[model samples]
Target: SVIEINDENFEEEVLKSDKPVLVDFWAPWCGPCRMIAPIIEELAEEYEGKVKFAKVNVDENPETAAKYGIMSIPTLLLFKNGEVVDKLVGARPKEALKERIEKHL
Candidate 1:
């Protein structure tokens, strides 16, 4: 399962992760965000130990989203070694998203 993050734990859970992390920045009411959700869960299971999966609720955690300059829902950020290395800005095919994760791995 993906870790649920907020401003309180965002730094420790994502910025300090030992493995690369895929953070799904989404909100409950976003239609596209919901469409992208299941794929993220599947990827979380597939990547398992190789990577960490996390989600930040844009509505509830505005501070965290602002920190990353997330201007839209369903924005995905790939963090490696404490910095963002890749970003995806919408709902996309699973393999396409997987390829991004592979790039960082």
Candidate 2:
């Protein structure tokens, strides 16, 4: 399952993680967020040892959301060494998501 990130711990848990991080910026009410939720979880499991996968509820964690300039729900941000390296905006297939992550891996 994906780790839950909030305004309070987002910087420490995501930005500072030793492994590559994939943060899903989403909200409970977003249909596309829900649609890609399972895919995020699957990635968490598939990349258990090599990467860190997390979810940040945009409504609840406004600080991180605003810092990342997340204007849309279901945005996926890939971070490496505390910097955002890639982004995906919208619900996408697992293959597409994997390909994005692979670029940074």
Candidate 3:
């Protein structure tokens, strides 16, 4: 299952994580965000113990959202060692996501 995060746990669940972390910055009403939700689930299972998957509800956590310069919805950020190394905006294919993440792993 995917992990849920907000400003409170962002540091603990993402920044401090030893494994590569994928953080989905999304909101409830975003169409593309919902479209990619299942793909995120698939990645969570595929990567399993190798990576950490997390979701941040933009509506509930504006601080974390703004801190990351999240001007758009459905942004997928790949983090390592407490910093954002890569980020993809808008919804994309599962294969595209997989490829981007593999680079970090």
Candidate 4:
């Protein structure tokens, strides 16, 4: 299962996490965001205990969204040690996304 985070717990749930975190920045109405949701969930399960998966609803969390310079929806950012290691804007195929995650693992 994926974690839901917002500005309130962003630091604790993501930044301070010891493992790598993949955060999906999305909103309810984004068509592409919905398209990639399942892939995210599957990857979360595949990674399982090795990584942390999180989602941020952009519509309700503008502060966190703006802080990250989220100019677009469905932005997936990979963070390790509280720093952004990789980010993908727009929906990506599962294989492509998984390969990127593996690089930082």
Q: Quick one: best lDDT, which candidate? A: 4
Better of 1 and 3 by lDDT: 3
Model 1 lDDT per residue over 4-99, tens place: 999999889999999999999999899999998999999999988999999999999989888889998799999999999999998998999999
TM-score of 2: 0.96
TM-score ranking, high to low: 4, 3, 1, 2
Give the TM-score of each candidate: 0.97, 0.96, 0.97, 0.98
lDDT of each: 0.92, 0.89, 0.93, 0.95
| Number of the top TM-score candidate | 4
Question: Any idea how many clashes model 1 has?
Answer: 0
| Stronger candidate by TM-score (2 vs 4) | 4
* Higher-scoring candidate on TM-score, 1 or 2: 1
Cα distance off (Å), candidate 3, residue 69: 0.4
Q: Can you tell me which runs of candidate 1 are displaced by over 4 Å?
A: none
Root-mean-square deviation (CA) per prediction? 0.7, 0.8, 0.6, 0.6
Of 3 and 4, the candidate ranking higher by TM-score: 4
Kindly provide the TM-score of model 1 when superposed on the true structure, using C-alpha atoms: 0.97
Q: Give the per-residue lDDT of model 4 (tens digit) for 31-99.
A: 999999999999989999999999999999999999999989899999999999999999999999999
lDDT of 2 by residue, 19-59 (tens): 89999998989999989988888888998988888999988
lDDT score, candidate 2:
0.89
C-alpha lDDT of candidate 3 relative to the true structure: 0.93
